[PDB]
Design an enzyme around this catalytic site. Structure first.
Site, short mmCIF file in Angstrom:
data_model
loop_
_atom_site.label_atom_id
_atom_site.label_comp_id
_atom_site.label_asym_id
_atom_site.label_seq_id
_atom_site.Cartn_x
_atom_site.Cartn_y
_atom_site.Cartn_z
N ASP A 290 0.83 -1.21 0.00
CA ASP A 290 0.00 0.00 0.00
C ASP A 290 0.86 1.26 0.00
OD1 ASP A 290 -2.57 -1.10 -0.15
OD2 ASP A 290 -2.58 -1.53 1.99
N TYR A 374 -10.23 -1.53 1.54
CA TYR A 374 -9.66 -1.39 2.86
C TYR A 374 -9.47 0.05 3.28
CZ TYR A 374 -8.79 -5.99 4.58
OH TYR A 374 -8.94 -7.27 5.09
CU LIG Z 1 -7.69 -8.16 6.78
#
Ligand SMILES: [Cu+2]
Ligand SMILES: [Cu+2]
Ligand code: NA
Ligand code: NA
Ligand code: NA
Ligand code: NA
Lengths: 620, 620
Positions: A290, A374
């Site tokens: 990320d 996320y």
């Molecule tokens: Cu997770």
């Protein structure tokens, strides 16, 4: 006036003009990364030079460039063409995400796969994911994204509830070609919706929660000066923001009497990797960096008063560059506030008759980022007693798949026909240490059990041992929770009043590290994640544990390469890299939106002060 | 009306009258323990019988007695004489603490030891400490306390700063005899004071902390009925209080739709041991069983609004017995409140356009106890998402010694000449489980690493394995942080909507367990502390991990004896016993009063619910 001030919109506009005039920012160019460089070691000459590092991508296929610019002087300092098959590709651009779904919508193979499943292509969302490096020789030197498909039944539907398993495509986003479409078989698309704002899923909302009002009638106890310089309860620090790393803390120091004592020169989360443990070929390539591939700072949320940050909040609004060099403000992207934190110290003494209670508090610096499904919160905490703590908060929607008939060893079932592959979320904290100055060393501290016998006749004694890490080759360490293992960063040239070196102790959570086979691609590209602690000798260009160019890099960059220099770290300018993470076996309760789970680390003083540093806290 | 209600002052007065009329509470008798017995299994007949268990000590040397009384019927149910050389001595009485210093003040050996050190006996405080069982054959069957001396320079002085090392005495508190005075040599008494309210030590108090105001303008979200029954955000439970264990939680249940689902039948901290790791004969016997020997509930603090408990606080004031059977109220001894707890769930979805944030909160139930130099806070937390957490907070003043010239492997230096011996603080949580009812089982869950190869060609897969614990002999388990080990308590007869057994996962902190040699006296008396997890079959009389009579018990009582029955625990009425603790190497910053350090555990739902249980939380 401070060299550590946040980048201004004016600085970014000047960088854009300097690049344009130098012929480096034509219509085919895109800025994939832009950030300020920290002052070099030894800035005690007042000769500030605000320099910016820029990664420039070219959408026509020409070689990208790394460029350094001085806004102070208005000059290009250096510009290097990059051979991306050698040193890695540039970070993914926000505008390349859209290309993937649009390209697949016109591909004959993609359309025939969707037709077999009776899916309307207008309702099929494609998650554009980083590619890694695997067996596909045609991908070397090309910018590839891989796509996984989800069905959106209507514009406000959560597509994550409807994964289209058995299907994956690879896309060259520069040449605009679909290189491969792989269809391993038809799975039913899970039919239940995951719409967590739909009244028929939530039921009636609770009417039982009464308000909690947190206010500061006289304002907060911290001050902000120069835009980003914080002073709070003897702490002093600068809050930076970088589009790759997010919030960065500089010059963390503590005012002990009339001495300002440094503790940490620079603290950041310098990488974070999310590896998936499903061996299906549809997903066995799936690993998010990320930080290094996507840049977590550019997806930072605007935080809402009363929802995201509650209390008397002071905001910072950092400025970043868009892909064309225009400044973009992330409004209310960083929240700062203090929080009550329970009892600090307490004792009721029978003999003296004195009853004593003091309350603790902490200073909170936080931001939140969203990368696809996320969402991650990054929280830095400073406490009255000298403790420094980091906490990552993971929430959002879990990545889904079909749940195979007959079960799986690598996927959890969340709903009928709906699975969630096992995965980890692993972070690397880079701590450029400066305990009372720059001559530091690391010791590993284990508990020592003693045998009953002479000098220990009742078998009650126990002890501890400390091992100094002297060279980088011996500074790659593993946790051992059973022996209470911690690491102490000390300054051998700075002593407390008992003539012991001053120090700080790192307490880890001792969670599992990277689980993948050590011969895997991900173990080579994320080698930092295989060990709990690394110590290197500071160097200007050793910034990230995974190297500068993580996207589609073949492996071995970063920490394994740095430590091969085997440099002296015994009483030197050193950097601690701590790996920590969550291993996530999704549970039913994580669906359809996941309650926060957390992981982190903390550092506590260890003979840094001559006595408790909170004796002067008042009774309240 | 509830059988789980707190003991009333009237009930305790009735017990006193019943004991007196039966001839069991003459002038020579003392109540060493009094508490209500829980309802036996199967109270669904409304035939409530409030019974109390009483330990009666005799100050003339006659045998003590264990007595059970029914206040409902006004009768003595049973009364048994105790052979204390066999089954252990009764808990220490508050009034015996004073006897030790007064007796030593007239002993010729004690006075000559103090004279050699030029100490005024009027300024010498004696810490009266439990004796344990060691080599002294004359102690079998006698009530012994051991004394360590500290100097108090003036009435408000902290005596802990002035330990008198090299000297210890043993006292028979029934016959009022000093059995042994051991003097191993003169150490200088450390001279610096430790007075943390003295302006010349604190300096000027800070003027920089601005107030934090936490209020609930509409009152709290929980209700209290029947004195101690709590309902809060779908949770339901009863708050008990026992003079030995302190706060006890009964009938922890969660309202899931129109079903009240049990989770935990009874939760308590059933023992806590503080073993010292200094092999000096002055202290090598030193081990506190704060729960079993001293009774932590009887030393509970009265908690002050705004200092100890901040916010909208609801207090309980439990009633206990004094040594003569009179009721004594512990005013404001239990604080109850809710706290904001940050972000509960958050997601900003690109495809749906929906931005979603919800905030978390927790319900806090806490009390604080003071045992000599140490103060402990016990905190139980209930969260919106079904998580249950316990946290112990340790503060107070560290136990001190001289610091030997030439250093020590077992003692930290805190000030010139002042040492603090290494020690641990270890807790045992007793969790009488009732996951959706009483048929439960425990599985041990480890992460499983997989090798690169067929069916895992990219070497990314990882898995997990669960092992059912079927018999008590296999239910003594150790932590393994490296394999991510947790334990799941499930109900094999109650399934979620995916046809999986409902369950809760225990997450430990994985701190070191008891460090003493396994052949030591303390390892035999605190065998529970040598392992992280024990599971037993529920039995009415198996209450404490160390047995009923811990004081001067020779060893082996409690858990090692229970599990020898090797009972079936696979889908049965079971009890989980979790050992957890802090290993304390004192630091300079712990002196002269220690900032709080913490340890605990938590339980999270694991397929207990059919989806996230917090979808109905409103936007706030
Ligand atoms: Cu997770
Ligand atoms: Cu301690
Ligand atoms: Na390469
Ligand atoms: Na450094
Ligand atoms: Na015995
Ligand atoms: Na049970």
């Amino acid at each position: 006036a401070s060299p550590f001030r946040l980048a201004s919109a004016g600085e970014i506009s000047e960088v854009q003009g300097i690049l344009r005039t130098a012929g480096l920012l034509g219509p085919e160019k895109r800025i994939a990364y832009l950030g300020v460089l920290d002052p070099a070691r030894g800035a005690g000459s007042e000769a500030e030079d605000r320099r910016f590092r820029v990664f420039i991508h070219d959408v026509s296929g020409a070689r990208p460039q790394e460029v350094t610019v001085s806004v102070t002087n208005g000059t290009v300092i250096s510009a290097v063409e990059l051979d991306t098959a050698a040193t890695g590709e540039l970070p993914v651009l926000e505008e390349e995400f859209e290309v993937v779904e649009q390209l697949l919508a016109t591909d004959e193979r993609w359309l025939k796969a969707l037709a077999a499943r009776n899916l309307d292509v207008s309702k099929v969302r494609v998650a554009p994911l980083s590619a890694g490096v695997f067996e596909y020789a045609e991908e070397r030197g090309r910018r590839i994204l891989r796509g996984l498909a989800f069905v959106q039944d209507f514009p406000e539907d959560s597509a994550w509830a409807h994964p289209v398993d058995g299907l994956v495509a690879y896309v060259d986003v520069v040449s605009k070609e679909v290189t491969r479409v792989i269809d391993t078989g038809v799975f039913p698309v899970p039919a239940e919706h995951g719409n967590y704002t739909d009244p028929e899923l939530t039921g009636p909302l609770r009417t039982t929660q009464k308000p909690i009002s947190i206010t500061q009638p006289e304002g907060p106890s911290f001050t902000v000066t120069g835009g980003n310089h914080i002073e709070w309860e003897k702490w002093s620090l600068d809050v930076g923001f970088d589009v790759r790393e997010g919030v960065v803390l500089h010059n963390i120091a503590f005012r002990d009497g009339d001495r300002l004592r440094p503790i940490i020169n620079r603290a950041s989360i310098a990488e974070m990797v999310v590896p998936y443990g499903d061996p299906s070929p549809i997903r066995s390539w799936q690993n998010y960096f990320d930080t290094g591939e996507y840049l977590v700072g550019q997806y930072a949320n605007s935080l809402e008063l009363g929802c995201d940050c509650l209390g008397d909040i002071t905001y910072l609004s950092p400025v970043i560059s868009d892909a064309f060099g225009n400044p973009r403000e992330i409004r209310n992207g960083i929240c700062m506030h203090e929080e009550d934190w329970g009892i600090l110290a307490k004792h009721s003494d029978l003999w003296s008759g004195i009853n004593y209670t003091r309350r603790n508090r902490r200073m909170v610096i936080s931001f939140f980022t969203t990368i696809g499904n996320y969402d991650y919160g990054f929280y830095w905490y400073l406490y009255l007693d000298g403790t420094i703590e980091f906490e990552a908060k993971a929430t959002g929607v879990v990545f889904t798949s079909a749940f195979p008939e007959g079960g799986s060893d690598n996927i959890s079932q969340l709903a009928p026909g709906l699975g969630a592959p096992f995965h980890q979320h692993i972070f690397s904290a880079r701590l450029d240490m400066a305990i009372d100055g720059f001559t530091n060393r690391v010791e590993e501290e284990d508990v020592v059990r003693q045998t009953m016998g002479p000098g220990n006749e009742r078998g009650n004694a126990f002890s501890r041992k400390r091992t100094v890490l002297t060279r980088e080759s011996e500074a790659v360490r593993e946790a051992d929770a059973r022996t209470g293992r911690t690491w102490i960063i000390s300054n051998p040239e700075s002593k407390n009043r008992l003539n012991e070196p001053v120090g700080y102790k790192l307490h880890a959570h001792n969670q599992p590290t990277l689980l993948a086979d050590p011969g895997s691609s991900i173990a080579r590209r994320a080698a930092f994640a295989t060990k709990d602690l690394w110590v290197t000798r500071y160097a200007d260009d050793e910034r990230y544990p995974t190297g500068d160019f993580v996207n589609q890099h073949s492996g071995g960059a970063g920490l394994p390469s740095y430590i091969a220099q085997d440099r002296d770290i015994d009483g030197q300018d050193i950097v601690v890299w701590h790996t920590f993470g969550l291993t996530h076996f999704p549970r039913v309760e994580d669906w359809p939106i996941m309650p926060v789970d957390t992981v982190g680390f903390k550092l506590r003083p260890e003979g840094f002060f001559d006595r408790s540093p909170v004796l002067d806290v008042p009774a309240n």
